[PDB]
């Protein structure tokens with residue numbers, strides 16, 4: 001006949017911003033039209049104008065209402081403007097109503113879709129930060145008591161039991177200016193190199209903050225139809241790959257920390273191959289005999305780093321890689337985030353000792369690799385990762401000794417600046433440092449560059465990953481390295497970092 005009933009008051013979901021307060025996810029009022037079938041069933045002569053106004057075929061609309069003739073609630077159409085959502089109301093159809101609802105809009109769209117993620121039709125976090133921080137963002141719905149007549153129509157608002165509480169604002173670590181730059185340059189790089197996909201991560205080496213995180217391909221989170229699963233992947237956190245030669249600076253850190261190696265020491269890598277039983281370690285360039293430790297990194301000699309690894313033992317190398325976080329949980333709690341795999345042994349065999357040292361048979365994410373380089377850049381101290389703005393920086397862990405870290409930094413500056421080095425990674429006006437990698441996938445390759453700058457007082461670490469570029473010959477520092485140069489140049493300028501190569 002008629003009942004007093006309690007119902008929800010929806011909460012205003014919290015604003016997501018970038019680190020400087022630029023809006024990334026905003027709850028915006030949209031007009032929704034709904035209907036009460038029991039009321040509609042008393043006004044059937046109105047149905048065709050209501051259908052016509054909603055762009056619906058008259059018969060299909062009529063069937064829908066007849067089938068739901070004992071329900072008290074259906075949506076007619078959601079996400080209209082006030083002008084549209086009153087245009088139907090002007091018809092004054094019995095049992096037809098408008099409400100303002102909150103739904104998400106993403107002002108930067110595709111540029112930060114992977115990091116931010118999205119909400120569903122019910123305004124609850126479904127992907128990315130929206131999911132990860134849903135409790136923070138959602139707030140608590142209110143509650144009102146309401147008298148409903150025989151048909152379910154609200155005739156009295158009797159009393160509000162609980163007020164709604166809005167969600168909390170969340171400021172990300174991301175700097176939208178760096179994010180745009182990274183987004184544009186990664187996109188342009190895929191085109192110029194004919195690549196399938198890629199990732200770019202920028203980190204603050206002093207604070208642990210992820211300043212940028214972009215992938216190709218990407219998607220518009222405001223227009224999610226025809227949406228591919230591949231386009232939605234935040235590849236920087238949920239794809240694993242073999243890091244290859246980009247781990248060599250960690251092998252070198254172990255070497256310098258052992259007491260047995262200095263940069264000017266020599267290793268004989270002739271004839272560019274080395275047999276270990278059935279396996280054969282093979283260098284990309286095979287016209288070398290004696291190389292010093294910097295030369296091994298410049299030439300990216302797998303044989304050279306393998307011989308160092310035999311001398312110092314795999315255990316020291318594993319420990320450096322473990323401590324810098326390769327194949328280890330980041331603690332960010334991003335949905336689908338992968339940990340990868342740094343294999344361990346009780347007793348390391350010779351073949352596995354070599355392959356560990358040049359990053360073969362290891363599995364990492366782009367965020368892990370960036371974090372490892374941030375530790376190296378931050379004079380050997382690892383600051384915990386953050387996807388949110390860090391005002392009070394947590395204590396870091398000293399993972400490589402400061403002197404060893406500084407020596408390796410110097411060697412990586414030479415990798416970029418010295419004769420025969422990765423000259424295209426050079427950043428105009430600054431000294432930069434880094435290491436190239438090329439990884440077989442099983443004809444099909446990943447091109448990698450990881451580095452930091454300014455070399456003499458590091459501020460920013462960066463990883464560029466380009467998945468399957470279309471170059472026949474040697475990548476030769478011309479695929480991922482120029483992307484590092486362009487994005488690092490822009491990032492240092494936007495953060496007002498003083499040039500150190502005047």
Ligand SMILES: *C(=O)[C@@H](NC(=O)/C(=N\O)c1nsc(N)n1)[C@@H]1NC(C(=O)O)=C(CC2=CCN([C@@H]3CCNC3)C2=O)CS1
Nearest residue numbers: 242244245284300359360437438439440472473474475476
């Ligand atoms: C480190 O990255 C080294 N690369 C490897 O040995 C890998 N395959 O080549 C590899 N490691 S793990 C894994 N799954 N694969 C050395 N570094 C580089 C470099 O400095 O870029 C290499 C160069 C290189 C190999 C293949 N190259 C072209 C690809 C397209 N056609 C040839 C290329 O430039 C290899 S040794």
Ligand SMILES: [Cl-]
Nearest residue numbers: 284285286287
């Ligand atoms: Cl050769």
Ligand SMILES: [Cl-]
Nearest residue numbers: 477478479480
């Ligand atoms: Cl390259």
